[PDB]
Design a protein around this motif. Structure first.
Motif, PDB file in Angstrom:
ATOM      1  N   UNK A 799     -17.417 -51.211  45.814  1.00  0.00           N
ATOM      2  CA  UNK A 799     -17.930 -52.133  44.807  1.00  0.00           C
ATOM      3  C   UNK A 799     -16.805 -52.736  43.976  1.00  0.00           C
ATOM      4  N   UNK A 800     -15.873 -51.910  43.516  1.00  0.00           N
ATOM      5  CA  UNK A 800     -14.809 -52.357  42.630  1.00  0.00           C
ATOM      6  C   UNK A 800     -13.544 -52.750  43.375  1.00  0.00           C
ATOM      7  N   UNK A 801     -13.631 -52.979  44.684  1.00  0.00           N
ATOM      8  CA  UNK A 801     -12.470 -53.301  45.498  1.00  0.00           C
ATOM      9  C   UNK A 801     -12.564 -54.688  46.118  1.00  0.00           C
ATOM     10  N   UNK A 802     -13.521 -55.496  45.682  1.00  0.00           N
ATOM     11  CA  UNK A 802     -13.791 -56.787  46.293  1.00  0.00           C
ATOM     12  C   UNK A 802     -13.797 -57.867  45.227  1.00  0.00           C
ATOM     13  N   UNK A 803     -13.495 -59.086  45.650  1.00  0.00           N
ATOM     14  CA  UNK A 803     -13.515 -60.233  44.757  1.00  0.00           C
ATOM     15  C   UNK A 803     -14.950 -60.666  44.489  1.00  0.00           C
ATOM     16  N   UNK A 804     -15.364 -60.797  43.229  1.00  0.00           N
ATOM     17  CA  UNK A 804     -16.720 -61.277  42.947  1.00  0.00           C
ATOM     18  C   UNK A 804     -17.039 -62.634  43.542  1.00  0.00           C
ATOM     19  N   UNK A 831      -9.286 -59.446  36.250  1.00  0.00           N
ATOM     20  CA  UNK A 831     -10.677 -59.595  35.849  1.00  0.00           C
ATOM     21  C   UNK A 831     -11.205 -58.206  35.524  1.00  0.00           C
ATOM     22  N   UNK A 832     -12.217 -58.147  34.661  1.00  0.00           N
ATOM     23  CA  UNK A 832     -12.802 -56.865  34.295  1.00  0.00           C
ATOM     24  C   UNK A 832     -13.330 -56.150  35.531  1.00  0.00           C
ATOM     25  N   UNK A 833     -13.105 -54.839  35.588  1.00  0.00           N
ATOM     26  CA  UNK A 833     -13.387 -54.083  36.804  1.00  0.00           C
ATOM     27  C   UNK A 833     -14.882 -53.853  37.003  1.00  0.00           C
ATOM     28  N   UNK A 834     -15.526 -53.156  36.064  1.00  0.00           N
ATOM     29  CA  UNK A 834     -16.939 -52.829  36.236  1.00  0.00           C
ATOM     30  C   UNK A 834     -17.819 -54.073  36.194  1.00  0.00           C
ATOM     31  N   UNK A 835     -17.468 -55.046  35.353  1.00  0.00           N
ATOM     32  CA  UNK A 835     -18.177 -56.320  35.355  1.00  0.00           C
ATOM     33  C   UNK A 835     -18.115 -56.946  36.741  1.00  0.00           C
ATOM     34  N   UNK A 836     -16.921 -56.968  37.334  1.00  0.00           N
ATOM     35  CA  UNK A 836     -16.769 -57.506  38.680  1.00  0.00           C
ATOM     36  C   UNK A 836     -17.559 -56.702  39.702  1.00  0.00           C
ATOM     37  N   UNK A 837     -17.676 -55.388  39.506  1.00  0.00           N
ATOM     38  CA  UNK A 837     -18.500 -54.589  40.407  1.00  0.00           C
ATOM     39  C   UNK A 837     -19.951 -55.038  40.345  1.00  0.00           C
ATOM     40  N   UNK A 838     -20.446 -55.301  39.137  1.00  0.00           N
ATOM     41  CA  UNK A 838     -21.791 -55.847  39.001  1.00  0.00           C
ATOM     42  C   UNK A 838     -21.910 -57.197  39.695  1.00  0.00           C
ATOM     43  N   UNK A 839     -20.885 -58.040  39.569  1.00  0.00           N
ATOM     44  CA  UNK A 839     -20.927 -59.352  40.210  1.00  0.00           C
ATOM     45  C   UNK A 839     -21.028 -59.226  41.730  1.00  0.00           C
TER      46      UNK A 839
END
Length: 930
Positions: A799-804, A831-839
RNA sequence: GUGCUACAAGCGAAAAAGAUCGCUUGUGAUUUGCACUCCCCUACGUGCUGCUGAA
DNA sequence: TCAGCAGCACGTAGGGGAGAATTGGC
DNA sequence: GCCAATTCTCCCCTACGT
């Protein structure tokens, strides 16, 4: 559909409390008697095909059948006629209809006729449900009626079997019939219901355990038959000789870890021409080398060591479930008052009183006051309770069973209505004095279509989404995607789905790969409801935590270098103390001496390690320690001083600090959720560990199942209650956030296979023990089903290893976890990590996993040495969408698989783990350049 | 109502204990604000933790 | 950097549960 | 009049990785 519990203390007089203690003891005695008699009947009798039927009905029945049989378990049945007619009529109905000559309700109703038992109000006649619907009928027969007539007959025949048992002279429990004269019958029904529930649970558990043992036998037989170990007598003999030679030594064991490591060690390093001997041993390595000459080209150990593991596992597993009878103080049974059990009532001038009916006869009802909660905004009943001249005193009456209690405290967000139909009595023996609590549950009916309608976003884009879900989704629903990382407790993003609009940034298709352009979704805003609050508290907590770990490591080193078994108690510093000996034939095979701990404690001077040293070199440290033993005497006095100083440190530099911060009232969670609650949760566990070391040290081990010396009650209860409080507060924050932003769906991550959003520590000691993901998800479900918002779980691997935005593999930098480095136009931004995971989770959700970046291909090799690299439902849909992909596939499948690996995608190329890590290092190295 | 949320001295487990549990006396507390699905029964998994041995 | 042998939390999956209406002897 | 005894169990439509 959902029931939420509330506990209210009661205040009663001493006579009342004695009365209730007698009632509870009677409940426990009667329940134990019932279950024990049923067990005796189960064991002693397994014949006549009648007791077995009753046990089957108790195992696979509802509480309604328990109430039906209660009149036989105690005493008897006044009328035993209607049941015989009911079973005869239902048997004839089953014989009919199966003929198929009729296809209507009316024909069946005439077929049964009259005097067929069935005293109205049953499904097969007129299906009144609850309204009755003026004797409405559906008309033609359905399938469910013909299905359920069978279970109806099963119930009736079970009642008949109980009747036959009673008539034989075996059913009436002598204890129940002895007690029936002096106890009310409502109590007997209640005891029967609760004890039957407990016994049904136990019987199902025992059945499952026996089936488990049978399955273990079956799988061991399959394993021993598929590998043909009986045919390979010589190979088995060689393997057994190898196992015996290994067991000759005192440092050998057979385990799954050993088998998993053997494939990596011997099947790989043997081709290098040199013995790895990676902690393998001296004699063990020679024995392995000698025996492996017979099977150089194969791996006999890997395929032979599993049989012994299966045999020992099958031996160790239990056969029959362990049976625990109820005890008033050990295995409690809690009365559930109601119309079908002990009677109860609620009466209101300004205080609410609960009237409990006594267990015995000719004894008054008991009166208690429902003591309110800490801050109650409203607290009332619904029935008219105006004062009068004692019209009925304390009267317990039916016709008012669903009592309506209105209550609202400070923390609640809406007035809470509880429709009491049963109330639980609970007894606590805190401080040796009995106390009573009444537990009320409020019920709610939550609509159950949003889950199914949200399932259409989890289809594989190979088959059209389920039609029944395509027409039930809300048109303008708003979704939220949540991440539950540790340091930022919660991070969510909100998206707006518009069925009508079809030109938003995110597009969703509800058919084949690209078909039926069903709607589009937009991004609204993303937030995070955690902050570090004050950095001083976090700094102090971190300092105390690594001080604790330093001290624990120092005590581990102290124990390891010592001897014990000759410990002496000597008066040093005014205290008797107890130190263990030092002369134990000191060896030079010590581990990494805790040099950092010796620095911070100030105990280096005693052991005389100079400033010149590092954190990994031990041979120089070992030589220095040996030279200190030689030149300096380092007698027992030096060890005594070392131990005294380390105990003084642990008691004067750790415990006062822990107390002073614990009593500081920091985690009150007023107007702001402190992120340091999680660090405190870790430190409480660390404190428990340290105090355990301070407690069990210098003691002989427990032997032959002797009781535990210590309990550790205060600290354990502290830790548990703190964890529960922090979980509840996070759940309340999430609920308020969703309800204050008009959210109807929450999307969470399933990470049991791989955890990335949590801490990335290699050791498992700091994860899945203090903070439970599963409990977080459960609490979210519990607190969101109350308001009407559903949560759904999806796969979130990487989740946190990919571009939103571009779905490229971005770099998670090791220095900081709150920055993700991504390129989009040749330049890298953070970019924010957990926010990007949500994206990225949102992108996967709305497109129902259109694009994948991770597959597990297996390497295929034939006798010719060729390679095929075969890949393994969303994945197959992805292939079917891009490469559009049989007999050759089964042909490759039939070939032997050399091993299992994985392939990663980086645009138009599928790469291996080594080159993938290389590319991530490439994208992340440019950070230091700028 | 519980829980965020207990500190020191005695004495006994008790032969070592500064840890844990139980009693008796101290001493600030008194909510200053937040939240709260709660009971049992299984099986088997983890770590915890002492003692001992291993490269 | 694990091995064996006593106790011991909590997970991690399961298994029960927080009943309403009728109807003869009264 | 009335309380112990005794019959009562549905209405749905949904996924996916280990």
């Amino acid at each position: 559909k959902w029931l939420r519990s509330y506990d209210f203390s009661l205040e009663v007089s001493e006579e009342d409390t004695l009365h209730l203690l007698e009632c509870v003891k009677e409940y426990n005695e009667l329940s134990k008697a019932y279950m024990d008699y049923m067990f005796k009947l189960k064991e002693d009798h397994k014949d006549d095909l009648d007791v077995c039927n009753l046990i089957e009905r108790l195992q696979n029945g509802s509480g309604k059948e328990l109430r039906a049989l209660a009149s036989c378990i105690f005493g008897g049945r006044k009328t035993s006629e209607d049941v015989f007619l009911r079973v005869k009529s239902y048997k004839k109905a089953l014989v009919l209809i199966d003929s198929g000559e009729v296809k209507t309700y009316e024909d069946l109703s005439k077929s049964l006729g009259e005097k067929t038992g069935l005293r109205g109000t049953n499904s097969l006649f007129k299906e009144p449900k609850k309204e009755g619907k003026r004797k409405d009928r559906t008309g033609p027969l359905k399938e469910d009626q013909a299905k359920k007539i069978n279970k109806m007959l099963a119930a009736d025949l079970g009642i008949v079997s109980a009747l036959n048992l009673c008539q034989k002279g075996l059913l009436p429990i002598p204890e129940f019939a002895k007690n029936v004269e002096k106890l009310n019958k409502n109590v007997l029904y209640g005891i029967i219901s609760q004890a039957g529930s407990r016994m049904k649970s136990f019987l199902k558990c025992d059945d499952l355990t026996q089936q488990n043992h049978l399955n273990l036998k079956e799988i061991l037989k399959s394993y021993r038959l598929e590998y043909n170990l009986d045919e390979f007598q010589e190979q088995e003999a060689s393997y057994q000789q190898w196992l015996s030679r290994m067991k000759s030594l005192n440092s050998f064991a057979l385990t799954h870890r050993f088998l998993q490591g053997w494939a990596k060690r011997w099947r790989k390093q043997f081709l290098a021409g040199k013995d790895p001997s990676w902690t393998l041993g001296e004699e063990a390595t020679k024995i392995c080398k000698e025996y492996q000459h017979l099977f150089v080209d194969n791996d006999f150990i890997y395929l032979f060591g599993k049989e012994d593991l299966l045999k020992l596992k099958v031996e160790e597993r239990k056969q029959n479930a362990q049976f625990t009878l109820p005890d008033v103080i050990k295995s409690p049974i809690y009365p559930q008052l109601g119309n079908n059990g002990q009677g109860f009532g609620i009466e209101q001038d300004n205080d609410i009183y609960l009237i409990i009916q006594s267990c015995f006869i000719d004894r008054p009802n008991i009166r208690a006051k429902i003591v309110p909660h800490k801050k109650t905004s409203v607290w009332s009943l619904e029935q008219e309770n105006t004062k009068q001249t004692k019209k009925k005193n304390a009267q317990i009456d039916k016709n008012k069973i669903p009592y309506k209690l209105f209550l609202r405290r400070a923390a609640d967000r809406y007035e809470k209505q509880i429709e009491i139909s049963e109330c639980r009595l609970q007894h606590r023996f805190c401080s040796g004095k009995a106390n009573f609590h009444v537990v009320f549950s409020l019920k709610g009916e939550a609509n159950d279509t949003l889950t199914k309608a949200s399932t259409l976003f989890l289809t594989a884009t190979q088959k059209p989404v389920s039609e029944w879900s395509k027409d039930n989704l809300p048109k303008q629903m708003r979704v939220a995607f949540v991440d539950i990382g540790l340091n930022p407790p919660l991070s969510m993003s909100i998206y707006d789905y518009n069925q009508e609009d079809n030109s938003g940034e995110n597009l969703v298709y509800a058919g084949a790969d690209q078909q039926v352009p069903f709607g589009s979704a937009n991004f609204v805003r993303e937030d995070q409801i955690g902050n570090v609050y004050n950095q001083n508290l976090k700094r102090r907590i971190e300092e105390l935590n690594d001080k604790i770990f330093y001290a624990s490591s120092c005590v581990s080193f102290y124990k390891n270098i010592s001897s014990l078994e000759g410990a002496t108690v000597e008066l040093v510093g005014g205290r008797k103390v107890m130190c263990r000996q030092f002369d134990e034939e000191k060896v030079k095979d010590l581990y990494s001496v805790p040099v950092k701990a010796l620095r911070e404690l100030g105990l280096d001077h005693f052991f005389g390690l100079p400033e010149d040293l590092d954190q990994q070199n031990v041979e120089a440290a070992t030589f220095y320690i040996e030279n200190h033993i030689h030149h300096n005497k380092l007698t027992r006095k030096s060890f005594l001083s070392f131990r005294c100083k380390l105990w003084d440190y642990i008691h004067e530099k750790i415990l006062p600090e822990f107390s002073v911060i614990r009593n500081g009232r920091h985690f009150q969670f007023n107007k702001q959720f402190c992120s340091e609650a999680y660090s405190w949760m870790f430190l409480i566990h660390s404190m428990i560990r340290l105090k355990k070391s301070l407690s069990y040290s210098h003691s002989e081990p427990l032997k032959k199942g002797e009781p535990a010396t210590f309990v550790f009650k205060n600290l354990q209860n502290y830790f548990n209650n703190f964890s529960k409080n922090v979980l509840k507060t996070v759940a309340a924050k999430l609920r308020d956030y969703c309800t204050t932003h008009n959210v109807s769906l929450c999307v969470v991550e399933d990470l049991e296979k791989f955890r990335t959003s949590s801490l990335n520590s290699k050791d498992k000691n700091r994860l899945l023990s203090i903070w439970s993901h599963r409990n977080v998800v459960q609490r979210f479900e519990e607190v969101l089903t109350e308001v009407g918002i559903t949560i759904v779980s999806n796969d979130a691997r990487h989740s946190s290893q990919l571009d939103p935005v571009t779905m490229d593999w971005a770099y998670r930098d090791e220095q900081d976890k709150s920055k993700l480095w991504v390129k989009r136009d040749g330049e890298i931004f953070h970019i924010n990590a957990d926010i990007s995971s949500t994206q990225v989770q949102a992108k996967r959700f709305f497109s129902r996993y259109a694009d994948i970046v991770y597959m597990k291909t297996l390497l295929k090799k034939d006798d010719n040495g060729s390679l095929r690299k075969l890949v393994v439902t969303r994945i197959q849909s992805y292939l079917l969408r891009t490469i559009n992909s049989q007999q050759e596939y089964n042909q490759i499948v039939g070939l032997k698989t050399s091993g299992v690996e994985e392939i990663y995608r980086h645009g138009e190329s599928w790469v291996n783990l080594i080159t993938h890590k290389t590319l991530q290092k490439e994208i992340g190295a440019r950070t230091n350049v700028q």
